[PDB]
Amino acid sequence: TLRAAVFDLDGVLALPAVFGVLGRTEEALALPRGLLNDAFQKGGPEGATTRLMKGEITLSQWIPLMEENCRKCSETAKVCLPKNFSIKEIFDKAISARKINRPMLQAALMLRKKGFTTAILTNTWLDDRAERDGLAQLMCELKMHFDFLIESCQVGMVKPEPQIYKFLLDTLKASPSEVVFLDDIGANLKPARDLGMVTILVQDTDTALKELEKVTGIQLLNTPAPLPTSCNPSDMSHGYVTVKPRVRLHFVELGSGPAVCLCHGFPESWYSWRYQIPALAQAGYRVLAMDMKGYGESSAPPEIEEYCMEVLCKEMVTFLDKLGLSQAVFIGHDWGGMLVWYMALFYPERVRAVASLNTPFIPANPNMSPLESIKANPVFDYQLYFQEPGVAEAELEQNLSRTFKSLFRASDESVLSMHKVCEAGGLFVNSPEEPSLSRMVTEEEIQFYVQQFKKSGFRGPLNWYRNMERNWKWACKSLGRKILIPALMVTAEKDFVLVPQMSQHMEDWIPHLKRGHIEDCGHWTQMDKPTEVNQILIKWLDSDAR
């Protein structure tokens, strides 16, 4: 039975292949057929290319050796190479044009998800060209999804030499009959087959994947649309900043480019952005996903006043100061969405652009107490329940697994009607003791939240709701202002607490506001509809945040 799947890079996981570009160049320059592919393989096991693929020489050292072989070949063929002939230019273009074969990677992702050990086995080079970063990026994106990456130039062996196949088997810790090996080169497939491995000659991806699903017994073609890449907490870079004597802020960091600061809601974690973090880093951004004050590995002081918007915002500015960041784009959801609008109003110079998921911007009413305003809408009753210190803490801390399984549900699986919470005497009074697992979350993801909330519980998080009068007084200072920096409001059709209609008057205070809207989406936006959140945020970031 098969338990390992091995994929080649060129012509398998990345398309189009370099081999195909040499043939394409021959046709474009009207050179004799096979001239370039012949000069490329010249000398066979003793040639310039084998030395390159084994790591004896770098790509920049190889370029003039390929040039001499091209001259040698054209001379024999009794043809002249064009006066403008450049191997450097041909290969720069070829490497740059090569993209990830998305359905092939998807199949590799599915096999690994089903228990297969996966690896990339590739005949590659040590790239020292001025434009080497493009390839470095491609390799980074691909390698994360595999258990192993075996590169010829790193191991000093090449396909089709028998030793590299014995090396692969040793790294996989598998017998040959347990391995599927996919290659676009028949000669490189031959030693794997001779060893007893299942082999697939990759021409077109569809046929190769049909062969792959037939032999594995796993559906790989015509499959439902997969979720975006998630985060393994133990594989992330974890950052810590002391913003003041008793306050440290924890964050997860991924990627390079403009700083994008992700701010979660209640009662969440940096992990609520698990599907956004890899996608935003891949899109060309440096992601900083916070554990907001009171949560996870961030400090959780007991005082109510430690959680007023004025102090929370001041600390986020100090956080940027200590990291040496003059700005960041601030993206928030629920309570984080509220923080993010206040960062834009009070610290516009530090906010590159601002985006909110579900949380609308509604200016403070100076002629009404926030407590009066909250009583006016039956949807905000849960906020009154959260007022009395200790009451909501006891219900939320009683059974953590039940707390997160009851809360984290899609619009069609709700177990909590958020009205008459005070009258009913709690959030979960009409909710089961052992809720079923929502289609949005796995048991393991629920257990990550349970483990995080064991440190500080719900006091700090609930204190975010206990500064209504303080926040109202502070917000009233901003009443003559408008938000004029780039801004995005993302509404969720089925969020019955932060309803899309609550955002209807926002253009009065944010004239240049851009919008996003997600159909069939509940309150837990990021995990309910990750693919669509990613598409909206990436499109807005590339157009408005650089």
Q: Which does 255 bind (CB under 5 to 8 A by kind): ligand ONR, a second copy, none?
A: a second copy
Closest CA to 217 of 258, 180, 183, 260: 180
By beta-carbon proximity to ligand ONR, the closer residue of 116 and 266 is 266
Position 402 contacts ligand ONR (CB under 6 A): no
Distance in Å, CB of 152 to a second copy, minimum: 13
- Please classify residue 470 by burial: count the beta carbons closer than 10 Å to its beta carbon, then call 0-12 exposed, 13-18 middle and 19+ buried: middle
Q: Should residue 407 be labelled a site residue for ligand ONR when binding is judged by CB under 6 A? A: yes
Binding residues for substrate: 382
User: How deeply is 426 buried, as exposed, middle or buried, from its count of CB atoms within 10 A (0-12, 13-18, 19+)?
Assistant: middle
Q: Given the complex with a second copy, which of 251 and 385 has the nearer CB atom? A: 251
Which amino acid type is present at position 269?
S
- Strand ranges for 172-285 from DSSP E: 179-183, 198-201, 237-244, 247-254, 259-263
Contacted by 144, from a second copy, ligand ONR, none: CB < 5 to 8 Å by type: a second copy
Q: State the Cα torsion 525-531-535-537 to the nearest 10°.
A: 30
Known binding positions: 8, 10, 122-123, 184, 382
Q: How far is the CB of 138 from a second copy (least distance, A)?
A: 9
Contacts with a second copy, residue ranges (CB under 8 A): 51, 55-58, 60-61, 126-128, 132-133, 135-137, 139-140, 143-144, 154, 156, 234-242, 253-256, 259, 281, 286-287, 321-327, 346, 348-350, 352, 477-478, 480-485
Closest residue by Cα to residue 329 from 297, 283, 375, 266? 283
HSE-CB at 83 with a 13 A cutoff on CA atoms is 0
Q: Is 542 helix (H, G, I), strand (E, B) or coil?
A: helix
Residue 192 as a binder of ligand ONR (CB under 6 A): the answer is: no
Q: Assess whether 334 carries a catalytic annotation.
A: yes
Handedness of CA 509, 379, 371, 303 (dihedral sign): negative
- Decide: is 523 part of the binding site for ligand ONR (CB under 6 A): yes
Maximum separation of any 2 CA atoms in the chain, in Å = 94
87 binds, among a second copy, ligand ONR, none (CB under 5 to 8 A by kind): none
Chain centroid offset of residue 212 CA: 27
User: Least distance in Å: CB of 490 to a second copy?
Assistant: 21
Displacement of CA 390 from its chain's centroid (Å):
37
The smaller minimum CB distance to ligand ONR, of residues 407 and 518, is found at 407
Of 244 and 517, CB closest to ligand ONR: 517
Q: Choose the catalytic residue: 334, 381, 495, 544.
A: 334
CB-based contact 9:93 (threshold 8 Å): no
Q: How many residues bind ligand ONR (CB under 6 A)?
A: 7
Which of 76, 137 has the CB closer to a second copy?
A: 137
If binding is defined by CB under 6 A, does position 266 make contact with ligand ONR?
yes
523 catalytic? Reply is yes
Min dist CB 118 to a second copy, Å, is 16
Q: Which residue is catalytic, options 165, 271, 523, 544?
A: 523
Kindly report the CA angle at 529 between 434 and 401, in degrees rounded to 5?
Answer: 20
CA 362/CA 369 separation, integer angstroms: 14
The residues facing 181 across adjacent strands are: 6, 199
DSSP 456-504: HTTHHHHHTTS-HHHHHHHHGGGTT----S-EEEEEETT-SSS-GGGGT
Residue with smaller CB distance to ligand ONR, 239 or 426: 426
Of 275, 385, 465, 528, the catalytic one is: 465
Among a second copy, ligand ONR, none, the one that 266 touches (CB under a kind-dependent 5 to 8 A) is: ligand ONR
Please say whether the beta carbons of 498 and 330 come within 8 A.
no
Hey, what amino acid is at 318?
Answer: T
Q: Residues annotated in the binding site for phosphate, as ranges?
A: 122-123
Instruction: Find tokens 């228990």 and name the residue.
Output: 115
Is residue 497 close enough to count as binding ligand ONR by CB under 6 A?
Answer: yes
Binding mask 201-220 for ligand ONR (x = CB under 6 A): --------------------
Q: Which of residues 413-452 bind ligand ONR (CB under 6 A)?
A: 416, 427
Output 117 or 438, the one with its CB closest to a second copy: 117
Q: Which CB sits closer to ligand ONR, 61 or 373?
A: 373
Q: What share of the chain is helix, strand, coil (3-state, %, to 5)?
A: 45, 15, 40
Closest approach of a second copy to the CB of residue 489, in Å: 17
Q: Which residues bind ligand ONR (CB under 6 A)?
A: 266, 382, 407, 416, 427, 497, 523
* Active site residue ranges: 334, 465, 523
